[PDB]
Design a protein around this ligand. Structure first.
Ligand SMILES: CCCCCCCCCCCCCCCCCC(=O)OC[C@H](COP(=O)([O-])OCC(O)COP(=O)([O-])OC[C@@H](COC(=O)CCCCCCCCCCCCCCCCC)OC(=O)CCCCCCCCCCCCCCCCC)OC(=O)CCCCCCCCCCCCCCCCC
Ligand SMILES: CCCCCCCCCCCCCCCCCC(=O)OC[C@H](COP(=O)([O-])OCC[N+](C)(C)C)OC(=O)CCCCCCCCCCCCCCCCC
Ligand SMILES: CCCCCCCCCCCCCCCCCC(=O)OC[C@H](COP(=O)(O)OCCN)OC(=O)CCCCCCCCCCCCCCCCC
Ligand SMILES: CCCCCCCCCCCCCCCCCC(=O)OC[C@H](COP(=O)(O)OCCN)OC(=O)CCCCCCCCCCCCCCCCC
Ligand SMILES: CCCCCCCCCCCCO[C@@H]1O[C@H](CO)[C@@H](O[C@H]2O[C@H](CO)[C@@H](O)[C@H](O)[C@H]2O)[C@H](O)[C@H]1O
Ligand SMILES: CCCCCCCCCCCCO[C@@H]1O[C@H](CO)[C@@H](O[C@H]2O[C@H](CO)[C@@H](O)[C@H](O)[C@H]2O)[C@H](O)[C@H]1O
Ligand SMILES: CCCCCCCCCCCCO[C@@H]1O[C@H](CO)[C@@H](O[C@H]2O[C@H](CO)[C@@H](O)[C@H](O)[C@H]2O)[C@H](O)[C@H]1O
Ligand SMILES: CCCCCCCCCCCCO[C@@H]1O[C@H](CO)[C@@H](O[C@H]2O[C@H](CO)[C@@H](O)[C@H](O)[C@H]2O)[C@H](O)[C@H]1O
Ligand SMILES: CCCCCCCCCCCCO[C@@H]1O[C@H](CO)[C@@H](O[C@H]2O[C@H](CO)[C@@H](O)[C@H](O)[C@H]2O)[C@H](O)[C@H]1O
Ligand SMILES: CCCCCCCCCCCCO[C@@H]1O[C@H](CO)[C@@H](O[C@H]2O[C@H](CO)[C@@H](O)[C@H](O)[C@H]2O)[C@H](O)[C@H]1O
Lengths: 459, 19, 98, 52, 171, 606, 172
């Protein structure tokens, strides 16, 4: 992985040694070049994962997440450089450094072969993320949002640290390849019930699981746009990726420990979808949309079927691009009217016709219009949960209906109707804003032509 | 608007003898 | 109260630069920023990357598995053997308990 | 080398350097080169190692 | 021809010879002649040109041959080096068996379309063959879960072998 | 097979080129609508060649040209089934779309976004053809939801209108509720039969097919707007009249019936499903026709007519007559599209007036629109040997000679009489009597685009039914022996409706004032279903979203029982620890206590 | 209700005639019944007792509710009509033209020359318009939404821009 780790680090010298007026051009261009080379990770085999060294390996699960992560860095740079224009030069370079360091921790997190190396990097992403939210957020509440984000995560992570170290003691290793062959079954006992909880609660909080999700709408509403992009696109998927790996050693206890969390997700997804119908804040609506989508991922990981794992892998990638696009779309409105109130600026399709096309495409992927990968992921999950229990189609069906209602409600309220009279600073969409939107939707729609590369190890 | 920063009311939360 | 700077007005990048791409205030930097985003983003990553992905060699050996299965079905049907046996492992190599 | 374009070699060199280091790691993991049951064979007349 | 007629069998074709019972000209006859003249001939020549260039640059590719290694039954407990090879072999065979079921399914579906309204009686062999192979595939691989392995497959077989033994004991 | 397969694909590839030229800015933006209209005309020609080949020898084939994705033992390929149902529907849909597009060129002339309008109409058709030719359930689902989204964008064409946005969203709501059954059918078929391809489903022929077929019936209920999920189709009248013509004759609303037709190998063996669909169609055909008797919006009457006719097709499915239902789909497309286009001609000439109470005296003022309107009405009411007689008449005689629910048969017959009554209403009020429109007369139906587009559908409404019935192969045993009174039931109840409808219409002229009956209000207000359900369901769900889901749980209880309680406890403990006197005497006195309890209670000294 | 008694009766009369028209449809039949309905209003036209007059209004409204047409006629462009707000998607505020690219403005040199005069006329008049509203408004703010006319020559009626420059009812 050094062909990706090292050039990612070299982005830091590049940013700091760039001319004062070229920090965005240089960092954006060279982070796109790194994104290009990440496609070499798709040298995947039918039987064996791609194991580079004792430290790093890349299978079909981590490969698409790595490519999503490295694609997101250039997009985040494009999305931030407007609202950071008045920033002090050094504080602009420190902002970019926080994003580069986040990418560094992320690509190492997704390829760590040892679970305790995964834990440290998994935890290391907190610091740059927290600093972005609290230093470069705009509102007073960004400070409270930082604390909720920090302490929700740590409340779960610290038990996970104890469980992993206990697992290394008893099994002798935490290398994920070794665990595949040395895994022993988990037999019922209160001791194992809490080993199971410690291994899964840290990841449940990151997804987040319904009930434990309150940190997420706070963080999104306060984060800067680049922070919201990485939060929704990648950092949520650290929970999913971690769960997909650790469940290997939790069998067969996962048979009955899953029930309380499937119930929370199946019911929680209807509850958070319905919350979206009455949200007044556009960013908060998108945040609650992520909770509903990630509920499906939690259910799919817990029912442990080949179809559900394929569906979860596609959902994580599809959600990553769609939710990131939606936050970017809402941000472009915010940079004009400087409010997140959804009902404030209406009828924008009249004033920004092409940006209204992006709003349409983003909404269609969010409601999972076939054959988007949003629909492929969501459909595969629904097929597998139906076999788990037929009655789940009722809850899946209702969520699909409510998901369409709030997706098109967001489209209709902001883009259609009459424009707000007194709002007269809706300038024409910039090239930067249109290119940012297209760099989200075009790769998302292109992946429909070749969806096998985002279906994960069980394809 | 512009980014919020602590004002005097906020700063006085940390000027007392105790929190 | 205190001695504080008032909230500055909103700068419309189009006023000074009607051809602004929204990247930079400097028109020359603004053009270069647009060029690298479009060339490296669309012309390279999206166009070449899409072409690279389309021609990936037998991603995860799905084609070989189909060719191999054809070989086995041809052989087994000719020799009268079952297309597929219920037992994955030879039962002579297994020692049941009891 | 120019006064405007020397910073543009850092990331490309980092990739080349990382690529080089990645291949050196494979030199430490040859304990089973031409020894696995699946791929073990005889060397060709000029070959010295099945892979390097 | 292009594929193997044994793996993908097609029953011999039987086409009734035209028996026009009307004086009128048949529109399909002339459109067919136009299609051959206007579409088939130019498309055929363009292909023959391309087939000439390929014949001047003939090169080959091969179907990989995988030697057989000891399966998971012969591996000592927690011996990763032997487990790894048996595990990888079992994974390769799992993919191949998936495509075997696809081939048998493809035969079944081709028969259903080919036979039309008579498919119910004329695709009994294909249905029977499909039913048997799906039973074998289900026995090998069904209910193993996302984290399937050669070990879980073996444990499932042993459990099945035990049940068959006990019923045989009842006989 | 070379010509058959090549030609049936260019038909589909042809329709996409205007889409490709559009989104790739290689076209000639001058007269894009005529370009899109020309492409549809040529695609009709190319689709006739495969249809003739099927008519000749019954040639059918499946084309699986591209392998898209393999999920273990489920291979998904882009597949196109060119069978009986695809070869007849495609030329009919293109023929009607050819007229509608030519009609739209005149109707939408002043629309500034006419180029986008024709692009959406073309996508609307493309997604319908994907639906009709889909050979597996996933590819079919692409077309299923494509027409739904295209319908949403066209109903809400005038997006500054709040009522058009409500109608557009309402169509999605009702069709998504239907889509629960579609997903259910997919899940059952994958689980129990390990396939989504229509071939394997029919070869395996499941016996316990109650669950998958209920899912398909639920999906058909939403798409075809049967009772329970019906209100959205009349509300879909918000869209421009060309949308209504295409939405109701082809594209969307027929997909529901088509789905059930495609699965007749399963339904023909499940009597339980037949009983449900028959009752479902019978209430639908009766209720919607009952609502049309008192509607005054000319488009809402025709909208309710379509729901009534769709209910009839659902009845035909319910009596195990899938091919008659298909024939009615084809014949209905002709005169229903014409009726909508004729109403558009009237609405345009009367400066966007759609209330029949404000028309009249147009019989002579608009002669060609009047001829088409009368032909369309007679075709709809099964006049002998017009296009509507060859499907509808056979359906009724099969209905009363079958082993059927007696109530559904009686409901179906009464609705057939209601069809004549509301058809009489449109003619009597729009065309007869004295004019009731404003004084500045601008009636003008002399545009050749308007005349030609209606002229082509008028010929179809006269002969298309005769032509088709004489060319399709026979796939059943038509029932031709029956009592004289069962033979002529369709004709007589239609005539009686005409007579009664005429008497009712004449009473409006008398100088009498009557208070409305509860029955009159019930019909006018659509059985209060939209009034009650479109206030009660939105209110309860939306109120629960804010009050309980958000505030009570997310902003209160999920906060209280964890972060707010934990942080308060820590704040309390901090105060106990740190609130000290700073007195040497007290600290050392506590050292003595610590030492004593250390020895006495915990025996730390042992 | 801020409507006087006279306004309520006149409003009820109009609303009753329109619903009567929906019932009758035919113009001759409507004319016959509209005259009988008018005769009923003329019957109590001179009722000088407010208590009785108000009581007559209550019963009249009660009768209208029972007899109202469930689906009355609505003018197409009237609230609730089939063309209400049909053209809002085409109405674009005039301030959108300040953002036009110069190459777009160069296509209409004469239109944008005139537009500048209006914008010039708007700046010059604004100060006097604010002043006029300051001098005519009593302490405690206005009590009605009525606005004054201009009182001098060269003055424009205060708050005129968004009435004068509002989009055409059939813009595109
Ligand atoms: C290899 C590397 C290749 C890179 C990828 C190549 C593709 C990218 C080419 C883009 C550049 C070409 C260009 O200039 O576009 C001009 C094109 C037309 O220019 P325009 O006349 O000025 O109109 C601009 C308005 O936004 C126009 O707004 P509009 O509403 O009139 O149309 C825009 C359109 C956006 O584009 C589309 O939706 C295309 C139609 C769908 C196919 O949105 C819609 O039409 C919404 C309807 C959605 C239909 C979905 C129905 C279900 C069909 C599912 C079946 C799928 C089969 C597979 O501009 C765009 O709309 C850009 C959209 C790009 C997104 C493509 C989405 C594909 C879906
Ligand atoms: C005609 C009717 C209209 C049909 C709709 C138009 C669409 C079809 C046009 C395309 C026709 C050509 C075709 O399909 O072949 C393409 C083929 C698919 O068909 P194929 O699999 O058979 O490949 C053809 C080539 N051979 C024959 C050798 C196999 O390949 C692709 O689809 C390209 C996949 C692109 C996806 C990769 C995205 C780029 C990655 C950039 C990195 C950043 C992304 C963000 C990170 C995401 C996380 C992973
Ligand atoms: C919360 C903080 C305040 C409360 C203090 C937390 C500590 C108390 C938690 C008790 C949990 C039970 C437990 O600790 O298991 C002990 C068990 C000992 O078993 P052992 O003897 O080592 O092995 C042989 C078995 N005869 O250990 C084992 O057998 C292995 C267990 C693996 C390690 C489990 C780590 C404990 C996890 C507890 C928290 C899990 C829930 C996280 C909730 C997060 C919510 C956001
Ligand atoms: C349920 C399905 C749902 C589908 C969802 C996805 C929909 C997205 C839209 C799809 C667009 C249509 C695609 C179909 C056209 C052909 C696609 C293609 O790329 O053909 C390549 C073909 C692949 O070979 P195949 O074995 O079928 O499968 C490979 C597995 N990917 O190999 C070939 O055939 C080579 C073709 C060579 C053609 C020569 C003629 C070219 C003429 C110049 C054109 C200009
Ligand atoms: C979000 C929170 C989710 C909470 C999920 C709760 C799951 C509850 C699991 C309960 C079952 C625990 O597992 C159970 O533990 C006891 C440990 O004493 C084991 O039993 C053991 O202790 C019991 C004493 O109670 C003895 O009677 C028994 O002889 C001994 O073997 C059981 O063999 C095992 O079946
Ligand atoms: C394989 C790796 C490839 C890496 C590719 C990286 C692409 C980066 C593209 C940026 C190119 C910009 O190159 C640019 O050239 C000119 C001339 O030397 C420099 O100097 C220029 O500064 C300003 C721009 O603000 C100009 O108005 C001025 O005319 C010129 O002096 C710029 O400072 C430099 O930024
Ligand atoms: C995978 C695709 C395979 C086939 C590709 C074939 C490419 C051939 C491109 C031809 C031009 C297509 O693009 C478009 O075609 C039509 C008709 O031809 C032209 O349109 C012209 O004819 C039509 C109808 O006769 C008129 O509506 C239009 O006013 C006129 O300009 C457009 O000016 C041209 O921009
Ligand atoms: C399958 C297709 C079936 C098509 C059936 C077509 C309609 C069948 C004929 C229906 C009745 C014909 O019409 C019959 O004769 C005359 C019409 O001149 C009507 O006579 C009426 O005409 C005038 C019209 O101004 C009325 O004001 C008057 O009250 C009344 O005398 C009769 O009330 C009616 O009974
Ligand atoms: C879900 C299981 C794990 C959960 C672990 C969560 C631990 C707690 C993390 C957040 C700690 C924040 O600690 C503190 O919380 C309170 C409210 O909660 C905030 O205070 C805010 O709410 C309180 C009460 O609602 C008000 O009195 C106060 O005026 C307001 O500012 C503080 O600004 C914050 O500093
Ligand atoms: C599963 C274990 C999870 C462990 C998580 C880590 C716990 C960290 C605890 C930090 C506690 C200190 O946080 C403290 O909380 C109280 C909330 O009562 C806040 O206090 C706030 O609410 C109280 C009452 O609601 C007000 O009187 C006060 O004016 C207001 O500031 C403090 O401003 C904050 O400083």
């Amino acid at each position: 992985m050094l062909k990706y780790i090292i050039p990612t680090i070299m982005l830091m010298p590049l940013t700091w040694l760039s001319k004062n007026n070229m920090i965005w051009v240089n960092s954006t261009a060279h982070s796109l070049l790194i994104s290009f080379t990440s496609l070499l990770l798709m040298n995947q085999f039918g039987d064996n994962s791609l194991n580079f060294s004792l430290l790093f390996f890349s299978d079909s699960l981590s490969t698409p997440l790595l490519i999503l992560t490295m694609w997101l860095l250039p997009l985040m740079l494009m999305a931030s450089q407007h609202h950071l224009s008045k920033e002090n030069l050094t504080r602009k370079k420190l902002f970019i450094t926080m994003l580069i360091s986040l990418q560094l921790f992320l690509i190492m997190t997704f390829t760590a072969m040892e679970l305790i190396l995964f834990y440290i990097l998994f935890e290391a992403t907190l610091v740059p993320t927290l600093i972005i939210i609290t230093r470069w957020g705009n509102q007073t509440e960004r400070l409270n949002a930082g604390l909720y984000f920090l302490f929700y995560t740590l409340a779960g992570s610290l038990p996970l640290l104890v469980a992993l170290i206990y697992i290394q003691n008893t099994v002798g290793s935490l290398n994920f390849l070794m665990l595949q062959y040395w895994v022993q079954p988990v037999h019922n006992s209160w001791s194992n019930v809490f080993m199971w909880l410690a291994c899964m609660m840290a990841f449940m909080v990151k997804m987040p699981l319904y009930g434990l999700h309150l940190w997420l709408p706070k963080a999104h509403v306060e984060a800067p746009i680049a922070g919201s992009m990485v939060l929704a696109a990648v950092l949520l998927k650290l929970g999913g990726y971690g769960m997909l790996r650790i469940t290997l050693i939790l069998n067969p206890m996962t048979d009955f420990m899953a029930y309380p969390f499937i119930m929370l997700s199946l019911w929680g997804m209807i509850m958070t979808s319905s919350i979206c119908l009455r949200q007044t804040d556009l960013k908060s609506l998108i945040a609650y949309s992520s909770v509903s989508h990630m509920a499906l991922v939690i259910v799919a990981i817990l029912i442990q079927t080949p179809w559900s794992y394929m569906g979860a892998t596609a959902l994580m990638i599809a959600h990553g691009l769609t939710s990131s696009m939606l936050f970017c779309l809402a941000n472009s409105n915010y940079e004009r009217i400087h409010s997140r109130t959804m009902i404030l600026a209406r009828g924008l399709q009249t004033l920004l016709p092409l940006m209204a096309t992006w709003w349409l495409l983003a909404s269609l992927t969010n409601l999972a219009l076939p054959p988007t990968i949003n629909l492929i992921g969501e459909l595969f999950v629904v097929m597998s949960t139906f076999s788990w229990s037929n009655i789940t189609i009722i809850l899946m069906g209702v969520n699909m209906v409510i998901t369409a209602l709030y997706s098109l409600y967001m489209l209709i309220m902001t883009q259609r109707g009459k424009y707000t009279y007194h709002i007269n600073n809706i300038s024409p969409s910039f090239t930067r804003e249109n290119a940012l939107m297209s760099l989200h939707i075009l790769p998302l729609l292109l992946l429909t032509l070749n969806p096998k590369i985002i279906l994960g190890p069980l394809y | 608007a512009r980014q919020w920063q602590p004002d005097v009311e906020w700063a006085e939360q940390y000027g007392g003898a105790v929190m | 109260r205190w001695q504080e700077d008032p909230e500055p007005e909103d700068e419309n990048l189009y006023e000074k630069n009607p051809d602004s791409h929204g990247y930079d205030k400097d028109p020359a930097v603004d053009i270069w920023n647009m060029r690298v985003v479009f060339f490296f983003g669309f012309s390279i990553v999206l166009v070449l990357g899409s072409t690279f992905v389309a021609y990936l060699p037998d991603y995860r050996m799905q084609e070989w598995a189909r060719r191999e299965a054809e070989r086995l079905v041809k052989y087994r049907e000719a020799h009268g053997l079952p297309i597929m046996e219920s037992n994955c492992f030879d039962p002579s190599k297994i020692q049941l308990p009891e | 080398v120019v006064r405007d374009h020397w910073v543009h070699v850092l990331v490309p060199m980092g990739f080349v350097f990382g690529y080089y280091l990645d291949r050196k790691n494979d030199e430490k993991l040859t304990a089973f080169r031409n020894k696995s049951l699946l791929y073990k064979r005889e060397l060709k007349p000029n070959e010295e190692v099945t892979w390097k | 021809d292009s594929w193997d007629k044994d793996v993908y069998p097609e029953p011999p074709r039987r086409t009734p010879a035209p028996s026009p019972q009307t004086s009128l000209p048949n529109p399909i006859t002339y459109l067919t002649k136009a299609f051959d003249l206007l579409v088939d001939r130019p498309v055929t020549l363009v292909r023959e040109f391309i087939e000439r260039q390929h014949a001047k640059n003939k090169y080959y590719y091969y179907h990989r041959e995988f030697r057989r290694v000891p399966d998971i039954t012969e591996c000592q407990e927690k011996d990763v080096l032997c487990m790894f090879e048996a595990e990888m072999q079992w994974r390769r065979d799992y993919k191949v068996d998936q495509e075997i079921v696809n081939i048998i399914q493809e035969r079944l579906k081709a028969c259903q379309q080919r036979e039309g309204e008579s498919h119910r009686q004329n695709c009994a062999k294909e249905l029977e063959q499909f039913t048997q192979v799906v039973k074998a595939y289900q026995d090998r691989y069904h209910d193993l879960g996302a984290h399937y392995s050669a070990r879980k497959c073996l444990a499932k077989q042993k459990q099945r072998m035990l049940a068959e033994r006990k019923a045989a004991k009842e006989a | 097979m070379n010509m058959f397969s090549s030609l049936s694909l260019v038909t589909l590839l042809l329709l996409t080129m205007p889409i490709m030229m559009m989104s790739f800015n290689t076209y000639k933006p001058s007269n894009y609508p005529l370009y899109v209209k020309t492409a549809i005309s040529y695609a009709f020609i190319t689709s006739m060649i495969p249809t003739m080949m099927f008519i000749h020898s019954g040639q059918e084939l499946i084309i699986s040209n591209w392998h898209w994705l393999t999920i273990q033992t489920l291979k998904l390929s882009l597949s196109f089934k060119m069978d009986y149902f695809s070869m007849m529907f495609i030329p009919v849909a293109l023929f009607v779309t050819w007229s509608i597009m030519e009609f739209s060129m005149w109707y939408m002339y002043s629309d500034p976004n006419i180029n986008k309008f024709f692009k959406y109409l073309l996508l609307f058709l493309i997604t319908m053809l994907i639906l009709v030719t889909a050979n597996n359930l996933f590819q079919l689902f692409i077309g299923w939801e494509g027409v739904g989204i295209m319908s949403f964008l066209l109903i809400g064409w005038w997006y500054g209108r709040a009522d058009a946005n409500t109608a557009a969203l309402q169509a999605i709501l009702y069709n998504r509720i239907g889509d629960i059954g579609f997903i259910l059918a997919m899940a059952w078929f994958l689980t129990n039969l390990n396939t989504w391809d229509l071939q394997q489903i029919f070869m395996l022929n499941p016996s316990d097919s109650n669950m998958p077929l209920i899912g398909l019936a639920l999906a058909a209920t939403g798409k075809s707007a049967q009772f329970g999920l019906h209100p959205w189709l009349p509300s879909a009248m918000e869209g421009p009249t060309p949308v209504s013509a295409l939405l109701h004759s082809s594209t969307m609303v027929v997909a529901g019936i088509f789905l059930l037709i495609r699965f007749y190998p399963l339904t023909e063996n499940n009597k339980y499903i037949q009983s449900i669909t028959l009752c479902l169609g019978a209430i639908t055909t009766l209720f919607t026709a009952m609502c049309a008797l008192t509607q005054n919006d000319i488009k809402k009457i025709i909208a309710f007519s379509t729901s009534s006719q769709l209910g009839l097709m659902m009845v035909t499915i319910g009596i195990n007559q899938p091919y008659l239902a298909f024939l009615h789909i084809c014949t209905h497309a002709f005169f229903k599209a014409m009726l909508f286009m004729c109403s558009g001609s009237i609405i345009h000439s009367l400066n966007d007036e759609q209330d029949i109470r404000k028309m009249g005296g147009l019989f002579k003022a608009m002669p060609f629109t009047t001829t088409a309107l009368i032909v369309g009405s007679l075709a709809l009411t099964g006049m002998p040997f017009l296009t509507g007689f060859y499907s509808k008449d056979l359906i009724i005689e099969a209905a009363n000679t079958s082993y059927t629910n007696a109530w559904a048969l009686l409901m179906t017959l009464i609705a057939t009489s209601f069809t004549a009554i509301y058809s009489t209403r449109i003619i009597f009020f729009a065309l007869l009597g004295q004019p009731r429109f404003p004084t500045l007369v601008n009636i003008n139906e002399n545009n050749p685009l308007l005349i030609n587009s209606i002229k082509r559908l008028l010929i179809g409404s006269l002969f298309a039914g005769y032509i088709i019935s004489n060319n399709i192969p026979p796939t059943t045993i038509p029932q031709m022996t029956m009592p004289y009174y069962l033979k002529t039931t369709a004709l007589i109840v239609t005539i009686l409706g005409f007579i009664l409808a005429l008497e009712i219409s004449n009473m409006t002229k008398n100088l009498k004032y009557h208070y409305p009956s509860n029955a009159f209000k019930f019909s006018t207000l659509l059985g209060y279903f939209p009034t009650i359900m479109h206030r009660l369901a939105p209110y309860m769900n939306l109120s629960m979203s804010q009050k309980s889901a958000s505030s009570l749980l997310d902003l209160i209880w999920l906060e209280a029982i964890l972060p707010k309680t934990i942080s308060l406890a820590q704040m309390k403990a901090s105060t106990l620890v740190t609130n000290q006197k700073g007195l040497i005497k007290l600290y050392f006195l506590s050292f003595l206590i610590t030492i004593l309890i250390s020895m006495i209670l915990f025996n730390f000294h042992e | 209700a801020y409507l006087t008694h006279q306004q309520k009766v006149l409003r009820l009369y109009k609303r009753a005639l329109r619903h009567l028209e929906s019932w009758c449809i035919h113009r001759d039949k409507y004319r016959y019944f509209a005259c009988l309905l008018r005769a009923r209003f003329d019957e109590h036209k001179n009722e000088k007792d407010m208590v009785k007059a108000t009581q007559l209004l209550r019963e009249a409204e009660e009768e209208f509710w029972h007899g109202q047409h469930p689906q009355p006629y609505i003018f197409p462009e009237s609230p609730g009509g089939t063309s209400y707000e049909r053209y809002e998607c085409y109405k674009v505020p005039e301030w959108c033209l300040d953002d036009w690219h110069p190459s777009e403005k160069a296509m209409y040199p004469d239109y944008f020359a005139k537009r500048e005069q209006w914008k010039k006329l708007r700046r010059e008049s604004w100060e006097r318009e604010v002043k006029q509203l300051q001098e005519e408004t009593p302490v405690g703010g206005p009590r009605t939404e009525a606005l004054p006319p201009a009182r001098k020559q060269g003055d424009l009626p205060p708050l005129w821009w968004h009435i004068v420059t509002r989009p055409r009812e059939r813009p595109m």
